[PDB]
Amino acid sequence: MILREFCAENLTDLTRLDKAIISRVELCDNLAVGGTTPSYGVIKEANQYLHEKGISVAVMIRPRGGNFVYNDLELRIMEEDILRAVELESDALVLGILTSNNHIDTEAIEQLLPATQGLPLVFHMAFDVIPKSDQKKSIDQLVALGFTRILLHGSSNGEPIIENIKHIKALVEYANNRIEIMVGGGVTAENYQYICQETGVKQAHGTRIT
Amino acid sequence: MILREFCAENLTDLTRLDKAIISRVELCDNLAVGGTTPSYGVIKEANQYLHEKGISVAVMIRPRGGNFVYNDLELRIMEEDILRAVELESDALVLGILTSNNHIDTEAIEQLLPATQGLPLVFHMAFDVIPKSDQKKSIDQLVALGFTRILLHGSSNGEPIIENIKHIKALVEYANNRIEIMVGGGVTAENYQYICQETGVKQAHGTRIT
């Protein structure tokens, strides 16, 4: 039983979702740039709408597109958006911060931890930018930071996820159930099952997951 | 002389703005779909940042891309986003609602008027979708609804704004100072001056206005 997560932009396509197949949705806007934090109205209404249909909501916390190297003002934005996301009863927060050298910016993330108020945390696709050699350590760091899961593609150049099986499986084995691994990027209703059984992953993310 | 409005997506490109040339900014996100309501954090920080530099902020109120024919839930989203925009000291609200027959949905707009709490209101590019024959009446309706200005391109098929001079001028003359007309869509630092003098328009909107 693989857990499927639908990646939505606002609540336009939510009316066809069914908890029987989709258990969670990643709520964001601007998917053209990879997804950003949706408006307050969208978060409040989507959460109530989805909860009503029995589906969890993971809110995207990203101040804009491009880099994952945020300046002070952008971090101030993210902290604010996190406070609202929690007061609006969001089930999870999706974020990702990296240093100029493509490593996990632990200090920046710790600055936002208090605002998270214990809600489940997920590190997004920014994980793939991390050099493959520092990948495993990053997992340990995410575990130490209290993160619940990691959404990754297995590569950063956009190659077919099907060719990242070996690497993704190594990450799952190394994670050793200390944190959940979720596959995303090119994950559809045609390959999500195969990819999961060959890697040991039990969660799939995608805009065309169904 | 001519008032220039910069169309921004979040606050990434705001650091170079100067009140000496840009007096107002239209704040939104997801410009790929024409612009939607930005996150709460972006509105709060952008308003404080821009006000600090002496520039007004018009916040986009649009629950998603595509149509301007909103369902009840989407109208609930817009009312919520309007309440937040005002409590965050926004200077203006940008919205646009149309009926299935491409006419101004007066009843829907009136439902949101109370939440606006008197802030200046602007009707966006959705105005161009209105059949050219019902264009002038729409202006009267916007005046009756208490709107401050209208952002329009002068055509709905995306033709060069330079070819809409005659129509745009007719709208300005008909508006007769009862409401401000602002040009947008293909308006750059190379044609905004010419377009304004030939139409009588005194305000220009654009991502490349400078």
PDB file of C-alpha atoms in Angstrom, chain B:
ATOM      1  CA  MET B   1       4.155  63.354 -15.324  1.00  0.00           C
ATOM      2  CA  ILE B   2       3.104  59.796 -16.271  1.00  0.00           C
ATOM      3  CA  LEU B   3       2.637  57.534 -13.244  1.00  0.00           C
ATOM      4  CA  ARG B   4       4.460  54.213 -13.678  1.00  0.00           C
ATOM      5  CA  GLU B   5       3.416  50.977 -11.957  1.00  0.00           C
ATOM      6  CA  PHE B   6       5.755  48.014 -11.705  1.00  0.00           C
ATOM      7  CA  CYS B   7       4.229  44.510 -11.851  1.00  0.00           C
ATOM      8  CA  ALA B   8       6.178  42.266  -9.469  1.00  0.00           C
ATOM      9  CA  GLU B   9       6.154  38.617  -8.477  1.00  0.00           C
ATOM     10  CA  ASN B  10       7.035  38.526  -4.781  1.00  0.00           C
ATOM     11  CA  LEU B  11       9.794  40.870  -3.644  1.00  0.00           C
ATOM     12  CA  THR B  12      12.781  39.514  -5.497  1.00  0.00           C
ATOM     13  CA  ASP B  13      13.033  42.446  -7.921  1.00  0.00           C
ATOM     14  CA  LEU B  14      11.942  45.183  -5.520  1.00  0.00           C
ATOM     15  CA  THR B  15      15.422  46.115  -4.275  1.00  0.00           C
ATOM     16  CA  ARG B  16      16.121  48.193  -7.384  1.00  0.00           C
ATOM     17  CA  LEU B  17      12.891  50.205  -7.362  1.00  0.00           C
ATOM     18  CA  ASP B  18      13.081  53.960  -6.806  1.00  0.00           C
ATOM     19  CA  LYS B  19      10.139  56.259  -6.020  1.00  0.00           C
ATOM     20  CA  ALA B  20      11.716  58.786  -8.368  1.00  0.00           C
ATOM     21  CA  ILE B  21      10.524  56.720 -11.351  1.00  0.00           C
ATOM     22  CA  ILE B  22       8.201  54.040  -9.967  1.00  0.00           C
ATOM     23  CA  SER B  23       5.414  55.282  -7.730  1.00  0.00           C
ATOM     24  CA  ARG B  24       3.451  52.068  -7.303  1.00  0.00           C
ATOM     25  CA  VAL B  25       3.842  48.326  -7.580  1.00  0.00           C
ATOM     26  CA  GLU B  26       1.253  45.659  -8.273  1.00  0.00           C
ATOM     27  CA  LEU B  27       2.086  42.866  -5.843  1.00  0.00           C
ATOM     28  CA  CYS B  28       1.230  39.315  -6.883  1.00  0.00           C
ATOM     29  CA  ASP B  29       2.726  35.888  -7.441  1.00  0.00           C
ATOM     30  CA  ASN B  30       2.547  33.341 -10.256  1.00  0.00           C
ATOM     31  CA  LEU B  31       2.968  35.810 -13.137  1.00  0.00           C
ATOM     32  CA  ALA B  32       3.139  32.823 -15.477  1.00  0.00           C
ATOM     33  CA  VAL B  33      -0.633  32.530 -15.132  1.00  0.00           C
ATOM     34  CA  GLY B  34      -1.192  36.285 -15.146  1.00  0.00           C
ATOM     35  CA  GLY B  35      -0.743  36.848 -11.431  1.00  0.00           C
ATOM     36  CA  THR B  36      -2.414  35.577  -8.275  1.00  0.00           C
ATOM     37  CA  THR B  37      -2.690  36.620  -4.656  1.00  0.00           C
ATOM     38  CA  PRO B  38       0.773  36.405  -3.017  1.00  0.00           C
ATOM     39  CA  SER B  39       1.407  34.684   0.328  1.00  0.00           C
ATOM     40  CA  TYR B  40       0.635  36.450   3.616  1.00  0.00           C
ATOM     41  CA  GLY B  41       4.326  36.811   4.391  1.00  0.00           C
ATOM     42  CA  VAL B  42       5.027  38.425   1.027  1.00  0.00           C
ATOM     43  CA  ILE B  43       2.193  40.951   1.450  1.00  0.00           C
ATOM     44  CA  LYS B  44       3.240  41.961   4.975  1.00  0.00           C
ATOM     45  CA  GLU B  45       6.941  42.313   4.205  1.00  0.00           C
ATOM     46  CA  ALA B  46       6.522  43.818   0.748  1.00  0.00           C
ATOM     47  CA  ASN B  47       4.155  46.505   2.068  1.00  0.00           C
ATOM     48  CA  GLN B  48       6.553  47.462   4.853  1.00  0.00           C
ATOM     49  CA  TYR B  49       9.550  47.334   2.513  1.00  0.00           C
ATOM     50  CA  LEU B  50       7.902  49.391  -0.221  1.00  0.00           C
ATOM     51  CA  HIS B  51       6.250  51.882   2.142  1.00  0.00           C
ATOM     52  CA  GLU B  52       9.689  52.376   3.672  1.00  0.00           C
ATOM     53  CA  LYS B  53      10.964  53.388   0.200  1.00  0.00           C
ATOM     54  CA  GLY B  54       7.906  55.578  -0.308  1.00  0.00           C
ATOM     55  CA  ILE B  55       6.041  53.502  -2.868  1.00  0.00           C
ATOM     56  CA  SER B  56       2.390  52.404  -2.875  1.00  0.00           C
ATOM     57  CA  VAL B  57       1.308  48.781  -3.121  1.00  0.00           C
ATOM     58  CA  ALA B  58      -1.677  47.372  -5.019  1.00  0.00           C
ATOM     59  CA  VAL B  59      -2.327  43.757  -3.985  1.00  0.00           C
ATOM     60  CA  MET B  60      -3.628  41.211  -6.485  1.00  0.00           C
ATOM     61  CA  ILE B  61      -6.800  39.429  -5.423  1.00  0.00           C
ATOM     62  CA  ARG B  62      -7.144  36.381  -7.691  1.00  0.00           C
ATOM     63  CA  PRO B  63      -7.642  32.819  -6.263  1.00  0.00           C
ATOM     64  CA  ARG B  64      -6.078  31.174  -9.329  1.00  0.00           C
ATOM     65  CA  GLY B  65      -5.373  31.489 -13.028  1.00  0.00           C
ATOM     66  CA  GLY B  66      -7.680  30.957 -15.964  1.00  0.00           C
ATOM     67  CA  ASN B  67     -11.256  32.303 -15.950  1.00  0.00           C
ATOM     68  CA  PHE B  68     -12.684  35.239 -14.058  1.00  0.00           C
ATOM     69  CA  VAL B  69     -15.899  33.289 -13.399  1.00  0.00           C
ATOM     70  CA  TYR B  70     -15.470  32.281  -9.770  1.00  0.00           C
ATOM     71  CA  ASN B  71     -17.459  29.747  -7.793  1.00  0.00           C
ATOM     72  CA  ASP B  72     -18.626  30.299  -4.201  1.00  0.00           C
ATOM     73  CA  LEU B  73     -15.537  28.730  -2.619  1.00  0.00           C
ATOM     74  CA  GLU B  74     -13.218  30.893  -4.733  1.00  0.00           C
ATOM     75  CA  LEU B  75     -15.201  33.987  -3.742  1.00  0.00           C
ATOM     76  CA  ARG B  76     -14.762  32.891  -0.102  1.00  0.00           C
ATOM     77  CA  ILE B  77     -11.014  32.750  -0.741  1.00  0.00           C
ATOM     78  CA  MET B  78     -10.966  36.245  -2.244  1.00  0.00           C
ATOM     79  CA  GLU B  79     -12.946  37.732   0.650  1.00  0.00           C
ATOM     80  CA  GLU B  80     -10.447  36.190   3.066  1.00  0.00           C
ATOM     81  CA  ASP B  81      -7.445  37.426   1.107  1.00  0.00           C
ATOM     82  CA  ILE B  82      -8.975  40.906   1.000  1.00  0.00           C
ATOM     83  CA  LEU B  83      -9.370  41.030   4.785  1.00  0.00           C
ATOM     84  CA  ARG B  84      -5.707  40.129   5.232  1.00  0.00           C
ATOM     85  CA  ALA B  85      -4.575  42.580   2.533  1.00  0.00           C
ATOM     86  CA  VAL B  86      -6.310  45.443   4.326  1.00  0.00           C
ATOM     87  CA  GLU B  87      -5.114  44.494   7.815  1.00  0.00           C
ATOM     88  CA  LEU B  88      -1.594  44.452   6.332  1.00  0.00           C
ATOM     89  CA  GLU B  89      -2.041  48.083   5.236  1.00  0.00           C
ATOM     90  CA  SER B  90      -2.187  47.514   1.479  1.00  0.00           C
ATOM     91  CA  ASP B  91      -2.867  50.683  -0.520  1.00  0.00           C
ATOM     92  CA  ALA B  92      -5.062  49.123  -3.189  1.00  0.00           C
ATOM     93  CA  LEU B  93      -6.773  45.893  -4.213  1.00  0.00           C
ATOM     94  CA  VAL B  94      -6.720  44.483  -7.760  1.00  0.00           C
ATOM     95  CA  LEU B  95      -9.525  42.113  -8.764  1.00  0.00           C
ATOM     96  CA  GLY B  96     -11.858  41.197 -11.602  1.00  0.00           C
ATOM     97  CA  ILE B  97     -14.975  39.064 -11.737  1.00  0.00           C
ATOM     98  CA  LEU B  98     -16.975  38.240 -14.872  1.00  0.00           C
ATOM     99  CA  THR B  99     -20.126  36.268 -15.627  1.00  0.00           C
ATOM    100  CA  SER B 100     -20.236  33.331 -18.049  1.00  0.00           C
ATOM    101  CA  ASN B 101     -21.356  35.824 -20.708  1.00  0.00           C
ATOM    102  CA  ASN B 102     -18.222  37.938 -20.204  1.00  0.00           C
ATOM    103  CA  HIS B 103     -19.962  40.787 -18.413  1.00  0.00           C
ATOM    104  CA  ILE B 104     -19.105  42.372 -15.101  1.00  0.00           C
ATOM    105  CA  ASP B 105     -20.475  40.219 -12.298  1.00  0.00           C
ATOM    106  CA  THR B 106     -21.871  43.074 -10.189  1.00  0.00           C
ATOM    107  CA  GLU B 107     -23.537  40.820  -7.627  1.00  0.00           C
ATOM    108  CA  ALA B 108     -20.315  38.919  -6.898  1.00  0.00           C
ATOM    109  CA  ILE B 109     -18.289  42.126  -6.549  1.00  0.00           C
ATOM    110  CA  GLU B 110     -20.864  43.674  -4.212  1.00  0.00           C
ATOM    111  CA  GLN B 111     -20.522  40.588  -1.991  1.00  0.00           C
ATOM    112  CA  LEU B 112     -16.861  41.523  -1.492  1.00  0.00           C
ATOM    113  CA  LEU B 113     -17.238  45.299  -1.182  1.00  0.00           C
ATOM    114  CA  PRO B 114     -17.813  45.308   2.600  1.00  0.00           C
ATOM    115  CA  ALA B 115     -14.584  43.384   3.237  1.00  0.00           C
ATOM    116  CA  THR B 116     -12.698  45.964   1.141  1.00  0.00           C
ATOM    117  CA  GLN B 117     -13.410  48.484   3.879  1.00  0.00           C
ATOM    118  CA  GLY B 118     -13.143  51.445   1.524  1.00  0.00           C
ATOM    119  CA  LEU B 119      -9.670  50.736   0.171  1.00  0.00           C
ATOM    120  CA  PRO B 120      -9.052  51.910  -3.435  1.00  0.00           C
ATOM    121  CA  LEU B 121     -10.202  49.301  -5.953  1.00  0.00           C
ATOM    122  CA  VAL B 122      -8.860  48.450  -9.395  1.00  0.00           C
ATOM    123  CA  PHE B 123     -10.410  46.160 -12.035  1.00  0.00           C
ATOM    124  CA  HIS B 124      -7.707  44.300 -13.991  1.00  0.00           C
ATOM    125  CA  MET B 125      -7.084  42.894 -17.497  1.00  0.00           C
ATOM    126  CA  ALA B 126     -10.332  40.902 -17.200  1.00  0.00           C
ATOM    127  CA  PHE B 127     -11.884  44.111 -18.542  1.00  0.00           C
ATOM    128  CA  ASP B 128     -10.579  43.340 -22.042  1.00  0.00           C
ATOM    129  CA  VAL B 129     -12.645  40.098 -22.173  1.00  0.00           C
ATOM    130  CA  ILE B 130     -15.814  42.200 -22.074  1.00  0.00           C
ATOM    131  CA  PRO B 131     -17.373  42.537 -25.552  1.00  0.00           C
ATOM    132  CA  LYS B 132     -16.212  45.874 -26.996  1.00  0.00           C
ATOM    133  CA  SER B 133     -19.840  46.963 -27.337  1.00  0.00           C
ATOM    134  CA  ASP B 134     -20.560  46.513 -23.604  1.00  0.00           C
ATOM    135  CA  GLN B 135     -17.221  48.102 -22.692  1.00  0.00           C
ATOM    136  CA  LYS B 136     -18.521  51.610 -22.005  1.00  0.00           C
ATOM    137  CA  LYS B 137     -21.415  50.400 -19.847  1.00  0.00           C
ATOM    138  CA  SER B 138     -18.962  48.327 -17.824  1.00  0.00           C
ATOM    139  CA  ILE B 139     -17.112  51.557 -17.017  1.00  0.00           C
ATOM    140  CA  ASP B 140     -20.325  53.136 -15.702  1.00  0.00           C
ATOM    141  CA  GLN B 141     -20.890  50.004 -13.624  1.00  0.00           C
ATOM    142  CA  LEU B 142     -17.356  50.151 -12.234  1.00  0.00           C
ATOM    143  CA  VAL B 143     -17.892  53.814 -11.355  1.00  0.00           C
ATOM    144  CA  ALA B 144     -21.141  52.872  -9.600  1.00  0.00           C
ATOM    145  CA  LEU B 145     -19.331  50.098  -7.730  1.00  0.00           C
ATOM    146  CA  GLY B 146     -16.880  52.681  -6.405  1.00  0.00           C
ATOM    147  CA  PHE B 147     -13.793  51.505  -8.319  1.00  0.00           C
ATOM    148  CA  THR B 148     -10.745  53.809  -8.537  1.00  0.00           C
ATOM    149  CA  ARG B 149      -9.102  52.629 -11.760  1.00  0.00           C
ATOM    150  CA  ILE B 150      -9.114  50.111 -14.572  1.00  0.00           C
ATOM    151  CA  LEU B 151      -6.095  48.258 -15.933  1.00  0.00           C
ATOM    152  CA  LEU B 152      -6.655  47.309 -19.560  1.00  0.00           C
ATOM    153  CA  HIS B 153      -4.869  46.305 -22.752  1.00  0.00           C
ATOM    154  CA  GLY B 154      -7.484  47.489 -25.231  1.00  0.00           C
ATOM    155  CA  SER B 155      -7.942  44.055 -26.827  1.00  0.00           C
ATOM    156  CA  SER B 156      -8.337  40.472 -25.611  1.00  0.00           C
ATOM    157  CA  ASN B 157      -6.491  38.490 -28.274  1.00  0.00           C
ATOM    158  CA  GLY B 158      -3.055  39.788 -27.279  1.00  0.00           C
ATOM    159  CA  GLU B 159      -2.546  42.133 -30.226  1.00  0.00           C
ATOM    160  CA  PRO B 160       0.043  44.934 -29.984  1.00  0.00           C
ATOM    161  CA  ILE B 161      -1.246  47.614 -27.608  1.00  0.00           C
ATOM    162  CA  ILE B 162       0.036  50.192 -30.121  1.00  0.00           C
ATOM    163  CA  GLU B 163      -2.863  49.172 -32.372  1.00  0.00           C
ATOM    164  CA  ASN B 164      -5.492  49.844 -29.699  1.00  0.00           C
ATOM    165  CA  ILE B 165      -4.928  53.588 -29.502  1.00  0.00           C
ATOM    166  CA  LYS B 166      -8.310  54.525 -30.970  1.00  0.00           C
ATOM    167  CA  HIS B 167     -10.292  52.245 -28.661  1.00  0.00           C
ATOM    168  CA  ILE B 168      -8.321  53.112 -25.528  1.00  0.00           C
ATOM    169  CA  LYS B 169      -8.779  56.812 -26.227  1.00  0.00           C
ATOM    170  CA  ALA B 170     -12.521  56.353 -26.652  1.00  0.00           C
ATOM    171  CA  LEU B 171     -12.641  54.658 -23.229  1.00  0.00           C
ATOM    172  CA  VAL B 172     -10.679  57.481 -21.623  1.00  0.00           C
ATOM    173  CA  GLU B 173     -12.986  60.090 -23.141  1.00  0.00           C
ATOM    174  CA  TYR B 174     -16.037  58.127 -22.031  1.00  0.00           C
ATOM    175  CA  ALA B 175     -14.584  57.653 -18.531  1.00  0.00           C
ATOM    176  CA  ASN B 176     -14.490  61.456 -18.360  1.00  0.00           C
ATOM    177  CA  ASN B 177     -12.305  61.523 -15.233  1.00  0.00           C
ATOM    178  CA  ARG B 178     -14.864  59.521 -13.252  1.00  0.00           C
ATOM    179  CA  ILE B 179     -12.343  56.718 -13.031  1.00  0.00           C
ATOM    180  CA  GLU B 180      -8.670  56.324 -13.955  1.00  0.00           C
ATOM    181  CA  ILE B 181      -7.557  54.297 -16.952  1.00  0.00           C
ATOM    182  CA  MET B 182      -4.208  52.492 -16.832  1.00  0.00           C
ATOM    183  CA  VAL B 183      -2.540  50.733 -19.753  1.00  0.00           C
ATOM    184  CA  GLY B 184      -0.996  47.295 -19.391  1.00  0.00           C
ATOM    185  CA  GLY B 185       0.057  44.273 -21.435  1.00  0.00           C
ATOM    186  CA  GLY B 186       3.062  44.894 -23.654  1.00  0.00           C
ATOM    187  CA  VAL B 187       3.687  48.289 -22.080  1.00  0.00           C
ATOM    188  CA  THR B 188       7.434  48.906 -21.782  1.00  0.00           C
ATOM    189  CA  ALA B 189       9.836  51.792 -21.214  1.00  0.00           C
ATOM    190  CA  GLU B 190       9.920  52.248 -24.990  1.00  0.00           C
ATOM    191  CA  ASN B 191       6.274  52.799 -25.789  1.00  0.00           C
ATOM    192  CA  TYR B 192       4.565  53.870 -22.565  1.00  0.00           C
ATOM    193  CA  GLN B 193       5.167  57.578 -23.204  1.00  0.00           C
ATOM    194  CA  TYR B 194       3.867  57.484 -26.779  1.00  0.00           C
ATOM    195  CA  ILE B 195       0.847  55.354 -25.878  1.00  0.00           C
ATOM    196  CA  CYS B 196      -0.125  57.736 -23.060  1.00  0.00           C
ATOM    197  CA  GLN B 197       0.110  60.952 -25.078  1.00  0.00           C
ATOM    198  CA  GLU B 198      -1.926  59.500 -27.957  1.00  0.00           C
ATOM    199  CA  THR B 199      -4.680  58.170 -25.695  1.00  0.00           C
ATOM    200  CA  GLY B 200      -4.768  60.617 -22.816  1.00  0.00           C
ATOM    201  CA  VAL B 201      -3.812  57.879 -20.335  1.00  0.00           C
ATOM    202  CA  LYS B 202      -1.621  59.044 -17.423  1.00  0.00           C
ATOM    203  CA  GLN B 203      -0.722  55.676 -15.862  1.00  0.00           C
ATOM    204  CA  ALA B 204       1.264  52.742 -17.237  1.00  0.00           C
ATOM    205  CA  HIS B 205       1.612  49.197 -15.897  1.00  0.00           C
ATOM    206  CA  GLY B 206       4.273  46.663 -16.823  1.00  0.00           C
ATOM    207  CA  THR B 207       6.977  44.202 -15.806  1.00  0.00           C
ATOM    208  CA  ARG B 208       9.463  46.092 -17.974  1.00  0.00           C
ATOM    209  CA  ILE B 209       8.094  49.597 -17.359  1.00  0.00           C
ATOM    210  CA  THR B 210      11.632  50.765 -16.509  1.00  0.00           C
TER     211      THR B 210
END
